[PDB]
Ligand binder design. Structure first.
Ligand SMILES: [Ca+2]
Ligand SMILES: [Zn+2]
Length: 387
């Protein structure tokens, strides 16, 4: 229930960015709570503690490009514009929903702390890229064809993000997608259920820009014809591809460190070495992640075996080919470098957000103390920057 504070302890709002298959606010169901699960309401807790926070609402299955744009408009407000060139290339709708805007004042000089979990960490990085450099393809497209271009793709918009803090983010992708998720058979099943769900207006998987909604005065025949011919089934413009090792690396090659931003990663492991060097899921591993945790533990790439049930340790620690440094909670602050936090033994992909109801070992006060620590770290940054 609780509103943001009149007089907040932080001058830069904490913006939380959920991950793949994540739903927050009024696209969520009955009583599902992404940030906290059944164990805690982290929005209520942080705001009662005096902080100004927001939980961004972006597509569950869409690409990081889609989601990074949606994040911009979630904060700044307006009609989502995915880009004329990008949308033409991948063969989908250019315009999405329209958000009201929770921080219309968001501009250079009045920045934000971006905390992301899982795929949200990729989405944040991709947004900061478009803010700073824009997108050269979009500028070239509107130079060539005219029309309007989004402020976001124009670029030259710095000093809008203070810190980027990722939690169990597959910066380097995950075998879970390579070998399972983005397989033609699984992704067919998923996108088919999402289209059926969109058509029935039952659940918004954030993929309506692919034509899942049925147009006006359209026979069912035409509708089934458009969907069958949609470029979605083969497209690289999906979240599942961006969670692939190859697709994550495509993003890694786009992004570069901003010397004025504070970066930090939080990584979990919930597997243990066994016979032959294989890894198997700890007792307490979240139910739905047991299978993927076990698969990742047995892959050929030996260093990728330790994992949180979805993301390998070395994937979460930092993006490859980007400067990093080992620190802990008492280390001094560093700008422009990925501050790699010690691996948290016993924490799985879901535990980080309290979404493991069966795991009694992870209490509500432990989860609350973890986000306290993060926010204290963000207040250290604000203190260090003012002076
Ligand atoms: Ca667990
Ligand atoms: Zn797209």
């Amino acid at each position: 229930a609780v509103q943001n504070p009149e007089n907040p302890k932080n001058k830069d709002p904490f913006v939380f960015v959920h991950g793949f298959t994540g739903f927050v606010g009024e696209v969520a169901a009955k009583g599902e709570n992404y940030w906290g699960g059944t164990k805690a309401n982290l929005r209520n807790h942080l705001r009662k503690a005096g902080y100004e926070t927001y939980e961004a609402s972006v597509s569950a299955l869409a690409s990081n490009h889609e989601r990074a744009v949606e994040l911009y408009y979630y904060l700044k407000g307006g009609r989502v514009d995915y880009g004329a060139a990008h949308s033409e290339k991948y063969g989908h709708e250019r315009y999405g929903k329209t958000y009201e805007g929770v921080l219309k004042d968001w501009k250079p000089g009045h920045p934000v702390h971006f905390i992301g979990h899982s795929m949200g960490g990729q989405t944040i990085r991709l947004l900061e890229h478009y803010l700073r450099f824009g997108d050269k393809a979009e500028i070239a497209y509107q130079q060539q064809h005219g029309g309007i271009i989004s402020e976001l793709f124009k670029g030259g918009q710095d000093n809008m993000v203070t810190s980027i803090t990722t939690i169990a983010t597959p910066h380097n992708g995950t075998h879970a997608s390579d070998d399972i998720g983005n397989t033609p058979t699984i992704r067919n099943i998923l996108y088919s259920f999402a289209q059926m769900s969109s058509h029935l207006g039952t659940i918004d998987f954030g993929m309506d820009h692919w034509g899942f909604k049925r147009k006006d005065g359209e026979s069912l025949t035409d509708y089934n014809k458009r969907i069958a011919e949609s470029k979605i089934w083969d497209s690289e413009d999906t979240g599942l591809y961006d969670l692939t090792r190859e697709g994550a690396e495509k993003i890694n090659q786009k992004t570069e460190l901003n010397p004025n931003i504070y970066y930090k990663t939080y990584t979990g492991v919930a597997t243990h070495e066994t016979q032959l060097g294989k890894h198997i899921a700890d007792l307490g591993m979240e139910f739905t992640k047991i299978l993927t945790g076990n698969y990742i533990g047995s892959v050929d790439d030996i260093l990728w075996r330790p994992n949180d049930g979805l993301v390998s340790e070395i994937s979460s620690q930092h993006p490859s080919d980007e400067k990093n440094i080992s620190v802990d909670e008492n280390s001094e602050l560093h700008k422009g470098t990925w501050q790699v936090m010690p691996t948290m033994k016993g924490w799985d992909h879901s535990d980080f957000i309290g979404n493991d109801a069966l795991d009694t070992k992870h209490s509500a006060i432990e989860l609350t103390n973890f986000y306290h620590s993060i926010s204290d770290y963000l207040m250290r940054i604000e203190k260090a920057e003012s002076t």
